[PDB]
Design a protein around this ligand. Structure first.
Ligand SMILES: [Mg+2]
Ligand SMILES: [Mg+2]
Ligand SMILES: [Mg+2]
Ligand SMILES: [Mg+2]
Ligand SMILES: [Mg+2]
Ligand SMILES: [Mg+2]
Ligand SMILES: [Mg+2]
Ligand SMILES: [Mg+2]
Ligand SMILES: [Mg+2]
Ligand SMILES: [Mg+2]
Ligand SMILES: [Mg+2]
Ligand SMILES: [Mg+2]
Ligand SMILES: [Mg+2]
Ligand SMILES: [Mg+2]
Ligand SMILES: [Mg+2]
Ligand SMILES: [Mg+2]
Ligand SMILES: [Mg+2]
Ligand SMILES: [Mg+2]
Ligand SMILES: [Mg+2]
Ligand SMILES: [Mg+2]
Ligand SMILES: [Mg+2]
Ligand SMILES: [Mg+2]
Ligand SMILES: [Mg+2]
Ligand SMILES: [Mg+2]
Ligand SMILES: [Mg+2]
Ligand SMILES: [Mg+2]
Ligand SMILES: [Mg+2]
Ligand SMILES: [Mg+2]
Ligand SMILES: [Mg+2]
Ligand SMILES: [Mg+2]
Ligand SMILES: [Mg+2]
Ligand SMILES: [Mg+2]
Ligand SMILES: [Mg+2]
Ligand SMILES: [Mg+2]
Ligand SMILES: [Mg+2]
Ligand SMILES: [Mg+2]
Ligand SMILES: [Mg+2]
Ligand SMILES: [Mg+2]
Ligand SMILES: [Mg+2]
Ligand SMILES: [Mg+2]
Ligand SMILES: [Mg+2]
Ligand SMILES: [Mg+2]
Ligand SMILES: [Mg+2]
Ligand SMILES: [Mg+2]
Ligand SMILES: [Mg+2]
Ligand SMILES: [Mg+2]
Ligand SMILES: [Mg+2]
Ligand SMILES: [Mg+2]
Ligand SMILES: [Mg+2]
Ligand SMILES: [Mg+2]
Ligand SMILES: [Mg+2]
Ligand SMILES: [Mg+2]
Ligand SMILES: [Mg+2]
Ligand SMILES: [Mg+2]
Ligand SMILES: [Mg+2]
Ligand SMILES: [Mg+2]
Ligand SMILES: [Mg+2]
Ligand SMILES: [Mg+2]
Ligand SMILES: [Mg+2]
Ligand SMILES: [Mg+2]
Ligand SMILES: [Mg+2]
Ligand SMILES: [Mg+2]
Ligand SMILES: [Mg+2]
Ligand SMILES: [Mg+2]
Ligand SMILES: [Mg+2]
Ligand SMILES: [Mg+2]
Ligand SMILES: [Mg+2]
Ligand SMILES: [Mg+2]
Ligand SMILES: [Mg+2]
Ligand SMILES: [Mg+2]
Ligand SMILES: [Mg+2]
Ligand SMILES: [Mg+2]
Ligand SMILES: [Mg+2]
Ligand SMILES: [Mg+2]
Ligand SMILES: [Mg+2]
Ligand SMILES: [Mg+2]
Ligand SMILES: [Mg+2]
Ligand SMILES: [Mg+2]
Ligand SMILES: [Mg+2]
Ligand SMILES: [Mg+2]
Ligand SMILES: [Mg+2]
Ligand SMILES: [Mg+2]
Ligand SMILES: [Mg+2]
Ligand SMILES: [Mg+2]
Ligand SMILES: [Mg+2]
Ligand SMILES: [Mg+2]
Ligand SMILES: [Mg+2]
Ligand SMILES: [Mg+2]
Ligand SMILES: [Mg+2]
Ligand SMILES: [Mg+2]
Ligand SMILES: [Mg+2]
Ligand SMILES: [Mg+2]
Ligand SMILES: [Mg+2]
Ligand SMILES: [Mg+2]
Ligand SMILES: [Mg+2]
Ligand SMILES: [Mg+2]
Ligand SMILES: [Mg+2]
Ligand SMILES: [Mg+2]
Ligand SMILES: [Mg+2]
Ligand SMILES: [Mg+2]
Ligand SMILES: [Mg+2]
Ligand SMILES: [Mg+2]
Ligand SMILES: [Mg+2]
Ligand SMILES: [Mg+2]
Ligand SMILES: [Mg+2]
Ligand SMILES: [Mg+2]
Ligand SMILES: [Mg+2]
Ligand SMILES: [Mg+2]
Ligand SMILES: [Mg+2]
Ligand SMILES: [Mg+2]
Ligand SMILES: [Mg+2]
Ligand SMILES: [Mg+2]
Ligand SMILES: [Mg+2]
Ligand SMILES: [Mg+2]
Ligand SMILES: [Mg+2]
Ligand SMILES: [Mg+2]
Ligand SMILES: [Mg+2]
Ligand SMILES: [Mg+2]
Ligand SMILES: [Mg+2]
Ligand SMILES: [Mg+2]
Lengths: 155, 386
RNA sequence: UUGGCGGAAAGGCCUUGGGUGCUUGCUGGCGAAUUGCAAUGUCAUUUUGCGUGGGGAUAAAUCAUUUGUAUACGACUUAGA
RNA sequence: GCGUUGGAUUGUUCACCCACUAAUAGGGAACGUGAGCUGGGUUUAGACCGUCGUGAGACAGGUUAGUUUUACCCUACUGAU
RNA sequence: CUAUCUAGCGAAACCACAGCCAAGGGAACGGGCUUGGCAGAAUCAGCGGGGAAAGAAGACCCUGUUGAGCUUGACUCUAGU
RNA sequence: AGAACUGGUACGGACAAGGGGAAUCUGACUGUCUAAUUAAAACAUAGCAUUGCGAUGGUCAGAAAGUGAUGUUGACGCAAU
RNA sequence: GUGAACAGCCUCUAGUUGAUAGAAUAAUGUAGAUAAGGGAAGUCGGCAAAAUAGAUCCGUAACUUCGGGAUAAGGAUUGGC
RNA sequence: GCCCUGAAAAUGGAUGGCGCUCAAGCGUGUUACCUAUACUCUACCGUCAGGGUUGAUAUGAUGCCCUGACGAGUAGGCAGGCGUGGAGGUCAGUGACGAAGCCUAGACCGUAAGGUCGGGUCGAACGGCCUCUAGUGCAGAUCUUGGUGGUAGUAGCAAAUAUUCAAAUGAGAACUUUGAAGACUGAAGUGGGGAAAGGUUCCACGUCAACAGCAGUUGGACGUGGGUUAGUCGAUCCUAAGA
RNA sequence: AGAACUGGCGAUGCGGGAUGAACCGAACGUAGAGUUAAGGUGCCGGAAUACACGCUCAUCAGACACCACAAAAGGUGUUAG
RNA sequence: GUCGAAUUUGGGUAUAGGGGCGAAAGACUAAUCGAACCAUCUAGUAGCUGGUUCCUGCCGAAGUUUCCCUCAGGAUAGCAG
RNA sequence: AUAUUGGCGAGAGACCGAUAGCGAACAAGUACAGUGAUGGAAAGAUGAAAAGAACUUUGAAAAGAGAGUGAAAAAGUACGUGAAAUUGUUGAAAGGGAAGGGCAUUUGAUCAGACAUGG
């Protein structure tokens, strides 16, 4: 309980979390925005395709020096990638959500992802040995993912 | 503080920037100065380079150690099947330059051309010029109207033509379309020639004849990203040099505090547009001819196609231009071929040439024989055969 | 609505025939206030979304796969009902 | 506008001689140019000689041997979406 | 084998604020000031012009009433003899 | 060891495996050292020369001693250059 | 096994197949090779590279402390049967 | 006099720029016009000076009131004040019906240091005024400790010839097991034991959060247990340089 | 480099000299209205493309104190003497 | 380079900081050497470098004199509160 | 009578309040380093009380989502409050080679000060 800012009807919605997850905060950040605002199945189906290297994830902030791809076009972009561990994580949380919305009795066919947000979790600290008897941090940047799915509203 | 010894600069600064050309079909940027008193005729031509080979001929150069003497010469053969007029363009002089006023297209454009206007032909409805064809439904009118317009306002007239790429060996089904300037008489007489030829065909013996110097516009073979040594002919640094030696040592003095636009740097080599001039026409090929590759001296019945076929190209079923020496671009690539922009009296350019023999051996290896006939006669009957 | 002309960016110009409103060329019959002694008053033209009633037209590009005249990656060039 | 070179001795710039040549002009750009090179000279520590000094040591004297770091940032430039 | 592109993993240096030039003046070589040239998102591979690039409070030189290693008929002493 | 026959005249067929020669400077030689910028012509050396000393002694150690090194020694010796 | 051989190369017993991986083959690299003609003209300087190389037989200079120099140099040969 | 010659230097450039030719150039003269924190008049703040005034007469006598002049500032001097921990005194001061603290392009007061208030958050203490006292105010010190960025999903994870097929187990397999193939170490070994040193790493079972710079079901990891048997192998005895 | 008197900069902003410590004008509490200084008034730019008499034509004109330089010597250019 | 000896080498033992050890480089003496390492004297001294924490109001400088192993510092007079 | 930064036993403070106070408020002369003499830290606070989340459900699990406990989960053994740097999301705006600042106003947002006069 207590997600970020939400502008949704909590009764037409179900939510999902995942904290202290070992997956590149930047990387997954980027895949999060990739579905942010999508219809749940469009997102799921597309995220699945990302594993297939059939479509990609647009890298828009954390992206200096990333290689370019033809698959960026779709989203008007030249630097994209395919962060498997990020989809794979994000997926399982898209799964929980869907599992919980159903449990809550919401119309799967109306569900869209109204909120999705990754924060930085506390760093994990490993050691690397550098030349001339020095030492340097070798760090994991864990993430906190959290998301919400919602029945789209009918006029 | 003054270079210790002088040397000339490397590279020419007027072929900048050394980038990749836009089109793969190089632009004609100039057409000969129209003499509007000769018959109407194209001024350039579309063709696909096939390969090269060797010639022999006596020389006609009084005062040369080789006058009245045999010389051998490399030649390149470009595959040039007749071209098809599918339209006309009207250009008008303006204080901002030439301007396309209208364009009038033919009623039936083949798939070869139609194809050009598509990126996924197979899954397209091929709706290309279907509603334009309706303009011909009327007695004339809409088409006659725009044809009348070019006659009134245009200051230069260009035909649209396109290769019949299907007549050639290439896998490319899509044909190349080009504008060509009409240089016959009256602006009226021009569009007339153009309307009269709609959907009809033009061959190369109606533009170029033998002994003609022609120019040859084309996009140079590509080589991708190149170091400064081979891209600029920069000198190769000593062997001892740390951090490699296919670089150049001094990218610049301290001031200007900026790498300058003229020092040599790594990057793209090849795929550049070049207009290459004064290539003399040695033989105009007739496609129907079974004696393409023969001579008034060597009379044997053979065609231009070498034994084994032109390497990496294929066979020459068609009319062809034999040009002396070489031509930009590589085998398979399109080449606009263009009449000279001037009247050369080079003597080297007035020499009428007559070949004595045309090397027709294989290029795919160290060819020994000219004709399958000759191989037989020489080697005798083999373990296959009979 | 009849003719024409305009290609420098013509996208406008002259011309023929009636139709229709206005006409301050002239002569009459009415109206106006109280918005209170100025504030505060004619609404111009851009786009853009929705509404109606009519006329109309009924495709492509990209991803992927493929060529190698191209190529560090993008890009380029081919091919596929 | 356009060229202004090949070499013997020297760490040399300089000097000088051979030779070719249309000509072998003079200079700048942090005495251009060391995250471009090289490291021969100079100018750390080893060592020999000569001169000087009682000596430790000295020399604008001769000599030999002596580790040449980093760009992935910004701009520039070259190419590329 | 790299570099290059992808999954996974993932540092460091360095950072007043920053990052296009020409002239001017100016602490006498400006990214910023003045006067001009100009000036169009976001970007990839290369590069070694420039950031007086970075890397140890200059090791040369000088100053300090600051040292230490060493030498000597400098000064003042001392184990010894 | 010798002879015949044989081959695209090859055959230490891969592997393995001294380039040579004429001189100058310089240290005789093998040997040694600046671990991490100097392997040298520097240090050493055999050889040569010089000096001191007969034990109550020469050279050296210790704050001192009924203390100690040379000395399990004695000049063909030990010590010092 | 080859061979002078505890060399190099190949194998048996025994033991490993463990050093992130996939796709491409731009530049520039690190490591390995090759070049027509010329043959040090490169350079401080042949640096780097190249050339020589086993064995049998023949042959072998100045000088020398008579021991050396000396594998001096220069040649012929080499498989299989 | 003006103009021309005399008059040659390195990025491309400077009457400031544009551009100007009976000038928008040079010499001279006449008027008008633009404009500084300066000058003139006035309001307000302060500082300084001169004066009036508690005569019985409500609320400041270090006060109220009238008048004139003045106002630059480093180093530095003095003055009047703002803010902090703790102390004496007093508002019988605020407070779980919410102290303090924190957040807030919300409000008000002061020239300012600062003060005050609303909303939010919170949860046990805390203010004002007169005085007392100092371990009393930060932007810097290549300051101290800690925490965090840009760099950057970047440099990179390229020495030691080399892997491949299938099955099995598992949520999950390039990496574990078994099978097969392909190869290496080549007895100067990637073989078999020991000395120093370690100290349980050995062995079985379970097992994967961390660790093995990809991964992991595997491990020298994690948890739990098991294991080292002597008259003859050593120590132990001996003496060595020495102590 | 170094003295004399004074005024400045340093310590000082404001207006002018494009720019600039030091020139010119003028020194500063918060403000309104007026007027000016030095300097300006074609356009950038607030303000007469004002008035008046001459001078000057440069295939290198010239354009404002400090100030961002020019000299000897020449000219049948042209002006006045 | 050298590779059967001035050979390489394990363990035990000995030498300790103005001391050792040195086939001699000021070399080595635990990544430390022209005097090791560890604590204390020690908050060693610094005419030198760096920093030095709130607001406003008033006044407001000196770089000059004399003396000083004085010349990057003091005393002294002046200027200032 | 005098001394007493050691030992035992006590009474105190205008001292400090977890980067302060002894180095140590804690399994502190501990963990760790070093051949050795020596060097030597970090680290206190859920709640009145574990009432430490039964049970259902998605998952391989860790966890999530319900539910439940509690005065509070805006206290979940990561735990009082929970600032700053720095970060995600949402919303508003601007952006031709920095940004930020001063005087002035347009435009948008926001906020005010006013109150009492017969029915
Ligand atoms: Mg969380
Ligand atoms: Mg970024
Ligand atoms: Mg980049
Ligand atoms: Mg890269
Ligand atoms: Mg490392
Ligand atoms: Mg180490
Ligand atoms: Mg030079
Ligand atoms: Mg020159
Ligand atoms: Mg060009
Ligand atoms: Mg090249
Ligand atoms: Mg070439
Ligand atoms: Mg080198
Ligand atoms: Mg270069
Ligand atoms: Mg070069
Ligand atoms: Mg050709
Ligand atoms: Mg060929
Ligand atoms: Mg127009
Ligand atoms: Mg009005
Ligand atoms: Mg190709
Ligand atoms: Mg020369
Ligand atoms: Mg020559
Ligand atoms: Mg100079
Ligand atoms: Mg220089
Ligand atoms: Mg440089
Ligand atoms: Mg260098
Ligand atoms: Mg040198
Ligand atoms: Mg030396
Ligand atoms: Mg030297
Ligand atoms: Mg050497
Ligand atoms: Mg580089
Ligand atoms: Mg560019
Ligand atoms: Mg990657
Ligand atoms: Mg200028
Ligand atoms: Mg200036
Ligand atoms: Mg100056
Ligand atoms: Mg200069
Ligand atoms: Mg500049
Ligand atoms: Mg700068
Ligand atoms: Mg300024
Ligand atoms: Mg891009
Ligand atoms: Mg490049
Ligand atoms: Mg640079
Ligand atoms: Mg840098
Ligand atoms: Mg210094
Ligand atoms: Mg002194
Ligand atoms: Mg002295
Ligand atoms: Mg010393
Ligand atoms: Mg004496
Ligand atoms: Mg020797
Ligand atoms: Mg020997
Ligand atoms: Mg050394
Ligand atoms: Mg040696
Ligand atoms: Mg053996
Ligand atoms: Mg091997
Ligand atoms: Mg083993
Ligand atoms: Mg590795
Ligand atoms: Mg060669
Ligand atoms: Mg030769
Ligand atoms: Mg040379
Ligand atoms: Mg040379
Ligand atoms: Mg030479
Ligand atoms: Mg060599
Ligand atoms: Mg060879
Ligand atoms: Mg034989
Ligand atoms: Mg010059
Ligand atoms: Mg210039
Ligand atoms: Mg003048
Ligand atoms: Mg005038
Ligand atoms: Mg005047
Ligand atoms: Mg004023
Ligand atoms: Mg003042
Ligand atoms: Mg106070
Ligand atoms: Mg207080
Ligand atoms: Mg206190
Ligand atoms: Mg009181
Ligand atoms: Mg409160
Ligand atoms: Mg409490
Ligand atoms: Mg007080
Ligand atoms: Mg305190
Ligand atoms: Mg303090
Ligand atoms: Mg601070
Ligand atoms: Mg700071
Ligand atoms: Mg400060
Ligand atoms: Mg990553
Ligand atoms: Mg990378
Ligand atoms: Mg590396
Ligand atoms: Mg593997
Ligand atoms: Mg093997
Ligand atoms: Mg072996
Ligand atoms: Mg196990
Ligand atoms: Mg790992
Ligand atoms: Mg793992
Ligand atoms: Mg046990
Ligand atoms: Mg026994
Ligand atoms: Mg002044
Ligand atoms: Mg000063
Ligand atoms: Mg002033
Ligand atoms: Mg000026
Ligand atoms: Mg301007
Ligand atoms: Mg004006
Ligand atoms: Mg005018
Ligand atoms: Mg003057
Ligand atoms: Mg005159
Ligand atoms: Mg000592
Ligand atoms: Mg020495
Ligand atoms: Mg150490
Ligand atoms: Mg050492
Ligand atoms: Mg102190
Ligand atoms: Mg004053
Ligand atoms: Mg005086
Ligand atoms: Mg004295
Ligand atoms: Mg000083
Ligand atoms: Mg503490
Ligand atoms: Mg502590
Ligand atoms: Mg608590
Ligand atoms: Mg806490
Ligand atoms: Mg609460
Ligand atoms: Mg709480
Ligand atoms: Mg819990
Ligand atoms: Mg908390």
């Amino acid at each position: 309980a207590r997600y970020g800012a939400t502008s949704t009807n909590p009764a037409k919605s179900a939510s999902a979390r995942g904290s202290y997850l070992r997956v590149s905060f930047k990387n997954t950040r980027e895949t999060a925005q990739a579905i942010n605002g999508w219809e749940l199945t469009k997102a799921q189906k597309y995220l699945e395709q990302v594993l297939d290297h059939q479509r990609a994830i647009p890298f828009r902030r954390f992206n200096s020096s990333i290689g370019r791809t033809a698959q960026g076009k779709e989203f008007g972009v030249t630097k994209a990638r395919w962060p498997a561990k990020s989809v794979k994580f994000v997926q399982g949380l898209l799964q929980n959500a869907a599992a919980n919305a159903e449990a809550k009795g919401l119309d799967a066919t109306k569900l869209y992802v109204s909120h999705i947000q990754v924060n930085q979790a506390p760093k994990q600290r490993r050691r690397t040995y550098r030349a001339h008897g020095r030492i340097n941090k070798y760090e994991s940047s864990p993430s906190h993912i959290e998301l919400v799915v919602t029945e789209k509203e009918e006029a | 503080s003054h270079r210790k010894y002088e040397a000339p600069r490397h590279g020419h600064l007027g072929f900048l920037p050394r980038k990749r050309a836009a089109s793969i079909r190089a632009r004609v940027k100039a057409f000969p100065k129209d003499d509007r008193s000769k018959p109407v005729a194209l001024t350039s031509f579309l063709g696909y380079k096939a390969g090269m080979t060797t010639i022999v001929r006596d020389l006609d150069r009084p005062g040369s150690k080789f006058h009245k003497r045999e010389v051998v010469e490399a030649v390149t053969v470009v595959d040039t099947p007749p071209v098809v007029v599918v339209g006309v363009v009207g250009y008008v002089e303006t204080p901002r330059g030439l301007r396309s006023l209208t364009t009038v297209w033919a009623e039936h454009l083949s798939d070869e051309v139609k194809r050009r206007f598509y990126k996924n032909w197979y899954k397209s409805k091929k709706k290309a010029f279907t509603k334009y064809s309706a303009k011909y439904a009327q007695d004339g009118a809409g088409i006659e109207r725009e044809l009348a317009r070019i006659k009134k306002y245009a200051s230069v007239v260009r035909v649209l033509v396109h290769t019949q790429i299907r007549k050639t060996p290439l896998a490319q089904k899509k044909a190349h379309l080009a504008e060509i300037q009409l240089n016959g008489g009256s602006i009226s007489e021009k569009v007339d020639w153009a309307r009269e030829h709609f959907e009809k065909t033009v061959a190369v013996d109606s533009v170029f004849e033998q002994n003609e110097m022609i120019d040859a516009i084309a996009v140079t073979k590509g080589h991708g990203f190149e170091g400064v040594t081979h891209r600029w002919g920069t000198k190769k640094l000593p062997r001892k040099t740390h951090r490699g030696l296919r670089k150049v040592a001094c990218i610049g003095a301290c001031h200007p505090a900026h790498v300058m636009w003229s020092v040599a740097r790594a990057g793209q080599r090849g795929y550049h547009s070049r207009t290459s001039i004064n290539h003399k026409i040695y033989r105009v090929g007739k496609g129907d001819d079974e004696a393409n590759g023969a001579t008034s001296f060597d009379r044997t019945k053979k065609t231009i196609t070498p034994m084994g076929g032109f390497v990496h190209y294929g066979e020459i079923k068609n009319d062809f231009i034999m040009v002396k020496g070489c031509i930009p671009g590589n085998r398979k690539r399109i080449v606009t071929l263009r009449k000279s922009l001037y009247t050369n009296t080079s003597r080297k350019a007035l020499e009428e040439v007559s070949l004595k023999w045309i090397d027709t051996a294989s290029k795919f290896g160290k060819g020994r024989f000219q004709t399958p006939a000759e191989k037989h006669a020489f080697m005798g009957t083999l373990k296959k055969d009979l």
